[PDB]
């Protein structure tokens, strides 16, 4: 008959998530984050999350809503001034989240282990650093069964698999079955997030038929196949205010406004009232109005 139609709404997708899940979030810093999916999380009652991410304003917004219990990350950055995300910083200085901070290469390594259903992969990164102190006994070493030529055996970090209950990623183009592509210079790690996860949700700028997808991009850009996706969300401008490859750049003015609004109770209630108290369409209309007013 027919392959499964995986098209769902933003609120449908978050409706499949549960409090207490370990969720990986794709993109990188302020780059192609599934921000519409994150805003849908904020509207929901899903909380007590363990988040695995190369962190940016996705983690900031989740922290603004108290939705993060534990975070696994290589960094958190807005990629532009003021660089440090102010909501992540507040959660940290308040001790509201338990962190398993790690080297950026360890995130990739851990996702790769989960993708291959392995319990660990060895890695040098982490040795001799306070990554050991962030993790304590959750991060162990592994000794090579093969000594080096000199007769000494290497002891490496055993990076444990970063198994995910769910993954949220945003891509530029996809079909209704989960085939999806990036456009632009970097896939980041969204394929690894999907491969490491049980439930996989991809938002895309535009849903097209399969044949249009494969004629629009090179083979190498088709980074998700149907085995890697459980739900597809059509979300134009769904990475705003992060950049999104060839679709659009970062909304630098609006990101600055987000960061400044976090500074006081007063400024944040107004940001929430204007941008985060309605639907994705309401958000998109308000963001467009902001850009016109600030020209």
């Amino acid at each position: 008959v027919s392959k499964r139609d995986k098209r769902i709404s933003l609120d449908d997708a978050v409706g499949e998530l549960r409090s207490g899940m370990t969720i990986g979030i794709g993109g990188w810093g302020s780059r192609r984050k599934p921000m519409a999916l994150v805003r849908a999380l904020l509207r929901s009652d899903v909380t007590d999350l363990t988040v695995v991410t190369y962190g940016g304003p996705d983690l900031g917004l989740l922290c603004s809503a108290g939705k993060v219990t534990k975070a696994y990350y290589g960094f958190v950055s807005l990629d532009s001034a003021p660089f440090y995300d102010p909501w992540f910083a507040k959660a940290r200085t308040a001790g509201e989240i338990a962190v398993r901070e790690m080297d950026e290469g360890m995130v990739k390594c851990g996702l790769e282990a989960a993708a291959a259903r392995l319990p660990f992969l060895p890695i040098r990164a982490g040795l001799g650093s306070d990554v050991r102190r962030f993790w304590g006994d959750e991060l162990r070493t592994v000794t090579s069964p093969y000594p080096d030529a000199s007769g000494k055996s290497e002891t490496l970090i055993a990076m444990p698999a970063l198994n995910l209950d769910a993954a949220l990623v945003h891509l530029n183009l996809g079909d209704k079955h989960g085939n999806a592509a990036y456009t632009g210079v970097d896939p980041y790690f969204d394929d690894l997030y999907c491969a490491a996860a049980e439930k996989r949700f991809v938002s895309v700028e535009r849903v097209v038929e399969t044949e249009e997808l494969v004629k629009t991009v090179p083979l190498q850009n088709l980074i998700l196949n149907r085995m890697m996706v459980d739900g597809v969300v059509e979300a134009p401008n769904g990475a705003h205010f992060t950049l999104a490859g060839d679709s659009y750049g970062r909304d630098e003015k609006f990101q600055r406004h987000y960061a400044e609004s976090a500074k006081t109770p007063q400024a944040w209630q107004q940001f929430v009232a204007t941008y985060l108290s309605g639907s994705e369409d309401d958000y998109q209309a308000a963001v467009k109005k902001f850009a016109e007013e600030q020209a």
Partner: protein, 247 residues
């Protein structure tokens, strides 16, 4: 007449002397000028990127595009790190006497008093390949006795019985005051040169610990005429370098 920032630029170029055919990864404006200056003078085989995902064929001015020669997305950077064929120049909120470095946060690990980036790639950088540091304002708050969080691995962390540590190498620290390495006794912070006009007392008053060889350190070399031309006319005609170099 040569400005303080111009001495810093050639010192940052000298970081890469003898580097050969490796990826130069400067993480601030002065090291960026330095790497590109080296590539245009004595290290043409350096690989450099646009800071995002493209490997440059030619050497462009700060902020400019150039024709490309290859692809370097973030996932492939981690392959380069693990291969060892790289020399990164990072910044630092803190550096101690043995080269431990912090860009993560201040205060306790699970409840810091100030949040920065987290450890980023600093652990993997310092354990895999040559790492150098740039400090635009040399102070005792940066050069401290103990860093709060070890994101960059220093020499007193090394286990000589475990060959997993054998690629660690901290090459230089360049600051607005001079050029330093960790070649002092017990791999301690050591002065190689002071920029013209900088006194030993100025360095000592702005470093929390004793600096090896400080009294005998000479003055940073003069840039060549070619280096001054490349800095002032080709690489940084708007003098963006001045914005980063304190006094």
């Amino acid at each position: 007449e040569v400005t303080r920032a111009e001495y810093c630029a050639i010192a940052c170029a000298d970081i890469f002397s003898g580097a050969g055919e490796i990826m130069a990864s400067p993480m601030a404006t002065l090291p960026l000028i330095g790497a590109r200056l080296a590539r245009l003078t004595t290290e043409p085989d350096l690989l450099i990127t646009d800071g995002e995902a493209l490997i440059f064929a030619d050497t462009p001015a700060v902020g400019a595009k150039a024709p490309i020669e290859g692809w370097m997305p973030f996932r492939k950077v981690f392959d380069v790190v693990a291969s060892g064929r790289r020399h990164v120049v990072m910044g630092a909120n803190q550096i101690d006497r043995h080269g431990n470095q912090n860009l993560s946060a201040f205060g306790p690990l699970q409840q810091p008093t100030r949040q920065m980036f987290g450890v980023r790639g600093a652990p993997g950088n310092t354990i895999n390949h040559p790492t150098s540091y740039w400090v635009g304002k040399h102070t005792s708050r940066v050069f401290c006795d103990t860093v709060d969080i070890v994101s960059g691995v220093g020499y007193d962390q090394i286990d000589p019985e475990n060959p997993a540590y054998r690629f660690h190498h901290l090459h230089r620290v360049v600051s607005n005051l001079g050029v330093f390495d960790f070649g002092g006794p017990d791999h301690t912070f050591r002065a190689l040169s002071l920029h013209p006009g900088v006194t030993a007392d100025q360095v000592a008053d702005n470093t929390s610990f004793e600096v090896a060889g400080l009294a005998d350190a000479g003055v940073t070399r003069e840039p060549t005429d070619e280096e001054l031309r490349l800095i002032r006319e080709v690489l940084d005609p708007r003098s963006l370098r001045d914005r980063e170099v304190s006094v």
